[PDB]
Design a protein around this ligand. Structure first.
Ligand SMILES: NC(=O)c1ccc[n+]([C@@H]2O[C@H](COP(=O)([O-])OP(=O)(O)OC[C@H]3O[C@@H](n4cnc5c(N)ncnc54)[C@H](OP(=O)(O)O)[C@@H]3O)[C@@H](O)[C@H]2O)c1
Length: 296
């Protein structure tokens, strides 16, 4: 069936549907709405679609109902199995998309998963990019995300206006899976920079140092990091909320270690970080921010 007009003209070929209105997806979709690209949203939990319905965005009943109404589907759900459900489940994107739709997975998973999604979607004549992001919840809210993209270079270029609504530095990394590969590199660094912060704070509190001065010194050379700038003021206030959930970093480190074993590289720091965050999930703190490691 054909459908009535929505917020974004059909002739633009740039109607976006957004799936996953979480800590990152809510602000990212709001940015696409401010820029005039957002036509529709889907969220598993309906209440989070409310603020978008109040601004006239269509709230779909399923990923398939969303895909039939848009040119570009952006997915920002938790993990690879979640992406599988929203693309390939009974009422997934592939059950409503027309050939020529583009799926952009902006969640974090792995190069292998990106290539699998692309291969499966190409059976339906659906295009795919992996475009994971860094900059945290603050970057999402401010629209300043760094977005790292794998797929057809032509499609990177066609979607650049959509990526610039959500982010600032938009980097084309290479073929499918190269955005996830860059993200796995990024998440090695983020995890170990976060363990750096939490161990420095544990030592500073054991030494009885003035936290005002500890924050002053650390917020500078070359101890200073993104993880300190984004999270040390929440940590010092005892605000353990995400931020970035510990269960999601555990997931990212699992993919890092799988890729390192495939390639014959030993990453003992990433292995330790995985163990630490695995324990944090087993202890029941998987939904706290990664900065609560050591303090939960
Ligand atoms: N937070 C950060 O700092 C950050 C930074 C960069 C990248 N990331 C990556 O971005 C992705 C999203 O992270 P987030 O922080 O936004 O997580 P989040 O706040 O936990 O939100 C996850 C979202 O995914 C939806 N979802 C999860 N499983 C699903 C399923 N099977 N079917 C349908 N929807 C499902 C959730 O729906 P409900 O609302 O129903 O729960 C929610 O909208 C993750 O891959 C994460 O690693 C996060």
């Amino acid at each position: 069936h054909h459908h009535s007009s929505g917020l974004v003209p059909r002739g633009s070929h740039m109607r976006v549907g957004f799936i996953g209105l979480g800590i990152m997806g809510g602000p990212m979709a709001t940015h696409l709405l401010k820029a005039g690209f957002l036509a529709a949203v889907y969220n598993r939990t309906r209440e989070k679609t409310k603020p978008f319905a109040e601004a006239g965005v269509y709230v779909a009943e399923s990923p398939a109902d969303l895909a039939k109404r848009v040119d570009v589907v952006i997915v920002m759900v938790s993990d690879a199995p979640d992406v599988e459900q929203v693309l390939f489940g009974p009422s997934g994107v592939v059950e409503g998309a027309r050939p020529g739709l583009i799926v952009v997975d902006m969640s974090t998973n792995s190069p292998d998963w990106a290539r699998k999604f692309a291969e499966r979607l190409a059976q339906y004549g659906i295009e795919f990019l992996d475009a994971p992001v860094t900059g945290g919840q603050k970057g999402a809210i401010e629209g300043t995300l760094t977005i790292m993209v794998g797929g057809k270079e032509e499609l990177f270029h066609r979607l650049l206006p959509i990526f610039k609504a959500m982010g600032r530095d938009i980097v084309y990394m290479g073929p499918v899976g190269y955005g996830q590969a860059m993200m796995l590199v990024n998440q090695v660094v983020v995890a170990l920079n976060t363990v750096a912060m939490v161990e420095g704070l544990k030592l500073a509190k054991a030494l009885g140092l003035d936290m005002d001065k500890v924050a002053e010194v650390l917020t500078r050379g070359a101890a200073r990091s993104g993880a300190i700038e984004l999270y040390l003021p929440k940590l010092l206030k005892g605000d353990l909320s995400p931020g970035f959930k510990a269960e999601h970093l555990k997931k990212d480190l699992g993919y890092v270690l799988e890729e390192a074993r495939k390639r014959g590289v030993k990453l003992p720091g990433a292995e330790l970080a995985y163990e630490l965050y695995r324990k944090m999930v087993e202890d029941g703190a998987g939904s706290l921010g990664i900065h609560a490691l050591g303090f939960y």
